[PDB]
Structure formats: C-alpha cells, structure tokens
C-alpha cells in the first residue's frame, strides 16, 4: 500500500527521501509521544509491582522505531541537510548564510558589530 | 636588600644596573653573508638594564631559598657589596667592542 506503514501527508516545500523518513517519524512519534510517556511512567514508577512494570518496559522495546524522537534529526527544511543545522531558522550553514545575506530572513543580515 | 645593608634599596639597584649594563655591544650583520662583519651596537636604557637583570635572575637560580622573590634581594645585596660575576661579563663585552671599533658604521 503506502510506502510508509501508515499513510502520511507530504512535507510542504522541499521534499527529500531522508526528509520523508524524518517527517514520517515526526508524525508517528507526535501521536505516540503520549503513549510513550504513559508507558515509560509505568515502567519507571517503583511504587508499582515489578511485573506490571516489566510488561511495560518490554512493550516499549517492541514499539516501532518511528515511535522515537532521538531518531528524528534536525534537517534543513529547505535543502534537506542534517549537518550544521541552526534551529532558529531550521536551516543550515549555507542556506542560512544565503537567505540571511540575500535578505530572505527578515532582521537577519551580517554581524558588522 | 635594604635590611642587609641599610641604605636606599631602589637607588642601590639603579647603581648596580648602571654598573652592570654594558654601554654598547656587537651585533653580527649579514651583508651578502659571506664574511658577516661584527659592528658595535648602541644599547638603549631599557636595552642596557634588560641584559643586566638577566645576568642577575640567572645568578638567582644558583642560590638556595625556595622563593625567587627574595633570592633576588640577596643577589641584589651581594651585588651591592661588589659581588656579581657579571662584572667580568661586562668587561669581556666591552673588550669585544674595543676591537671591532674600526668596523663602526660612521664616526
């Protein structure tokens, strides 16, 4: 059926296979984050019995990779680059310079000070 | 320094510097290398004392105290009495200038 296990809309603007993978994880984890938090609280509350806790720790290990944010890497929304990615503009060491110098980024120019 | 010999320490130090710092020297300019000539070089005030102070710190690393701050004073007191091997140092230098006086760039 859909390439990704669960059908997902496509990220507006620049689209990349690595971006699609990251975007897929973002969409899935966003919804699963609540469950991720629920079950982890379960496993970590000593105030409980070991078994209920274990059952949970285990399910987590079983939860699919997309159910994680550690797996989501900051990637330039415009150039699909995951290296030197400033998060203030969600860009990169180049698209920034480019956008900032060109003036695409308002109030962002050169540190002449 | 003052204590071991009760007279103005700064003045005594200045005198010691004046005594020790040679008034001139001899740099070794290249001039198409070959046989580089040795011509006496005049040494500025801060230039003169700089050499004198070294001959002293170098002589303060031969003392005993585990505090250079004051191994300096004793050397300084020693110099006052007239005991800093440096004097000879000066003498040789000057001598190496007496000769090599001829090479003087201009009168």
């Amino acid at each position: 059926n859909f390439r990704f296990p669960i059908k997902t809309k496509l990220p507006p603007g620049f689209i990349n296979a690595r971006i699609l993978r990251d975007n897929f994880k973002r969409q899935q984890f966003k919804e699963n984050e609540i469950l991720v938090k629920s079950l982890k609280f379960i496993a970590r509350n000593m105030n409980l019995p070991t078994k209920l806790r274990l059952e949970a720790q285990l399910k987590l290990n079983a939860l699919p990779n997309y159910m994680r944010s550690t797996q989501i890497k900051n990637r330039c929304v415009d150039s699909g680059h995951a290296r030197f990615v400033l998060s203030d503009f969600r860009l990169c060491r180049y698209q920034f310079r480019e956008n900032a110098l060109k003036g695409n980024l308002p109030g962002v120019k050169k540190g002449i000070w | 320094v003052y204590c071991q010999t009760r007279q103005d320490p700064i003045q005594a130090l200045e005198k010691s510097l004046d005594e020790l710092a040679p008034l001139m020297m001899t740099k070794t300019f290249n001039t198409g290398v070959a046989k580089a000539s040795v011509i006496p070089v005049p040494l500025n005030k801060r230039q003169r004392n700089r050499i004198a102070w070294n001959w002293i710190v170098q002589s303060a690393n031969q003392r005993v105290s585990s505090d250079f701050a004051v191994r300096l004073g004793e050397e300084l007191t020693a110099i006052a009495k007239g005991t800093s091997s440096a004097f000879e140092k000066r003498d040789q230098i000057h001598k190496t200038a007496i000769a090599h006086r001829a090479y003087i760039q201009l009168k």
């Binding site: 000593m46 274990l54 720790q57 285990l58 290990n61 | -």
Partner: protein
Amino acid sequence: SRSVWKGPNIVPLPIREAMTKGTPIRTNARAATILPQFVGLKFQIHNGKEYVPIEISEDMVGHKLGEFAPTRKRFSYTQT
C-alpha cells in the same frame, strides 16, 4: 538501562518455546542483559553478517548478548 532500579533489559525472546527443544533461537536483536532468570540455552548472535552460535555459562550473567559476539575482525600487518 544500567542501574540498581530500572534493572535491567527485557528483550522479547522466543526463550519460552526455545526452552523446550533448546533450538538455537536466532536472537538477532543482540542487545540485552543475558536474562538472569532463564540463564541457560544456546543461540547465534548476528555479528553484522553472521550470527555466532554460543550457549549460556557461569560467567554469562550481566554480560550482554553482544559482549560475546565479536564484530570487526582482527587487525593485520603493514605492506610487507
């Protein structure tokens, strides 16, 4: 998950059925404290390309499946 609490690592495993015949269960996961509960069987461990067959020992306890399954091969020599 290395701590007195949160001890230790539960990696879902066919140990149950394995505990019957003992079939070396291809536990490709290779990332779990050797379970101190069943502590005893035989299985192969994916060393990147091949799963090395090993069983359980009187040393293999906290030691994680991977610690027994070497990946990179040994170094060699210069040019001659």
